[PDB]
Every structure is written in C-alpha cells, then in structure tokens.
A paper describes a structure:
The 3 human RAS genes, [name], NRAS, and HRAS, encode 4 different RAS proteins ([name]-4A, [name]-4B, NRAS, and HRAS) which belong to the protein family of small GTPases that function as binary molecular switches involved in cell signaling. The γ-phosphate of GTP holds 2 regions, switch I and switch II, in a compact conformation that allows interaction with downstream effectors, such as CRAF, PI3Kα, and RALGDS, as well as with the allosteric site of SOS1 and SOS2.
Importantly, this compound series led to an affinity improvement of 5- to 10-fold, with the pyrrolidine analog 15 displaying an NMR KD of 440 µM. Given the significant improvement in binding potency of these compounds, we reverted to the use of the naturally occurring T35 construct, with NMR KDs being easily measured despite the reduction in visible cross-peaks for the G12D, C118S double mutant construct. C118S was introduced for stability reasons in NMR. As designed, the carbonyl oxygen of the dihydroisoindolinone forms a H bond to T74 at a distance of 2.4 Å, and H bonds involving the pyrrolidine and indole nitrogens of 15 are formed with D54. Important for further optimization was the observation that the side-chain position of E37 was ideally placed to form a fourth polar interaction with isoindolinones substituted at the 5 position.
Numbering used by the authors: 1 to 61, 66 to 167
Write the structure that this text describes.
C-alpha cells in the first residue's frame, strides 16, 4: 500500500483543520481552536487502489522547513471570503519552491468556505492563479463537506503523476 505524506497549509483561519477533520471524522468543527501541529491518517481507495494518507495539519499563525522537505504534496488553502488569504498563496508557494528546490511540486489550490455568503474571490480569479502555477483548483466547504474528498484525492493524483 502506497503512503502519501500530505501537508495542509494556508493562512490563519482559512479552515485547514476543519477540512482535515471532515476528511477523517466526517463532521464539521464550528469552534476556532488554533493549531500548533497535528497529524492524521486515513486509508482510502483512490482510483481503485488503496492509499494511506499521512496528513499534517499545520499552524497558520518552526517545523516548517522540515515539514516542507518531508511533504510530498501540499494543499494550499485560502478562504473565498478572505482576499488576504488568497494573496498569501504566493508566499506559501514560494516557500515550498525554496525548500524543495523545484518548480513542479505536487500542489492543489483549495478555495474553502464556499458555503458563506461573503464571497470576495470569484471562481475565475482562483482558476487563473491555479493555471498560472500549473496546479488544479478545487472549491470546498468544510461545513457542508463539498469538495473535501475531491481536494485530497486530487492531490494524491498529482503526487502519483510526479512519480
Ligand atoms: N462556514 C464555514 N466555516 C468554516 C469552514 N472552514 C472552517 N470554518 C470555520 O472557520 C474557523 C477556523 O477554522 P479552522 O479549521 O480552525 O481554521 P485553521 O486554518 O485551521 C486556523 P489555524 O491556522 O490557526 O490552525 C472555525 O470557526 C471553522 O468552523 C467552511 O468551509 N465553512
Ligand atoms: O519529517 C517529518 N515527518 C513528520 C510527518 C508525519 C508523521 C505524523 C505521524 C506519522 N508521520 N506526517 C507527515 C506528513 C507530511 C509532512 C511531514 C509529516 C513531520 C512533522 C513535522 C515536521 C517534519 C516531519
Ligand atoms: Mg488549524
């Protein structure tokens, strides 16, 4: 069984933990409990093959150089109602390029909080940014579970291609 080390990164509050907990536990955390560093594991079938997901949920607010070196793929999460978090994607992208010394690191752009009525980043904006970096884009809601499996499964597919 192939293991995949996945890292969830993004600004403080975009929903990194809520997305990961939805994937693992199938429920929505309404609380705001800032993360230091948590890991989760889940066995899944993706495209007919069992995969072990070893997922690191990171702080948005240390081990960063180390987890970027170890991580095989990155979910780069922003919130669709927070423009600052969208612009922060450039910073996370640049760091990952730096630590890994490559321009083709498996990544997926995730626009979370799609259920909220305060949208400030339209789908075209996000699709343009993802196209500019050569990565897929997935809209998610940790509240309704929209796109959660698809976001993580798409990242695994990007890792599979890279190997
Ligand atoms: N409506 C809605 N709320 C969400 C969604 N995702 C997260 N939230 C809410 O946003 C807040 C922050 O979510 P959380 O998962 O803690 O964000 P985080 O990026 O891990 C915060 P940190 O970087 O400090 O660990 C929580 O109150 C959570 O319920 C979503 O898809 N929809
Ligand atoms: O070299 C490191 N291995 C750690 C690790 C884990 C752990 C959790 C329980 C089993 N593997 N799963 C991961 C997923 C993505 C990236 C890093 C990890 C880690 C954590 C933090 C910093 C460096 C490192
Ligand atoms: Mg968190």
């Amino acid at each position: 069984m192939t293991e995949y080390k996945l890292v969830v990164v993004g600004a403080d509050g975009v929903g990194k933990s809520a997305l990961t907990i939805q994937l693992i536990q199938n429920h929505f955390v309404d609380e705001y409990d800032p993360t230091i560093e948590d890991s989760y594991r889940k066995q899944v079938v993706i495209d007919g093959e069992t995969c072990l997901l070893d997922i690191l949920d990171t702080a948005g607010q240390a081990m960063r150089d180390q987890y970027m070196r170890t991580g095989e793929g990155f979910l780069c999460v922003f919130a669709i109602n927070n423009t600052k978090s969208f612009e922060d994607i450039h910073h996370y992208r640049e760091q990952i390029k730096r630590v890994k010394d490559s321009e083709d690191v498996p990544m997926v752009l995730v626009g979370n909080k799609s259920d909220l009525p305060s949208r400030t980043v339209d789908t075209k904006q996000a699709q343009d940014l993802a196209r500019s970096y050569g990565i897929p884009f997935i809209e998610t809601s940790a509240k309704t579970r929209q796109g959660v499996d698809d976001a993580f499964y798409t990242l695994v597919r990007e890792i599979r291609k890279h190997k």
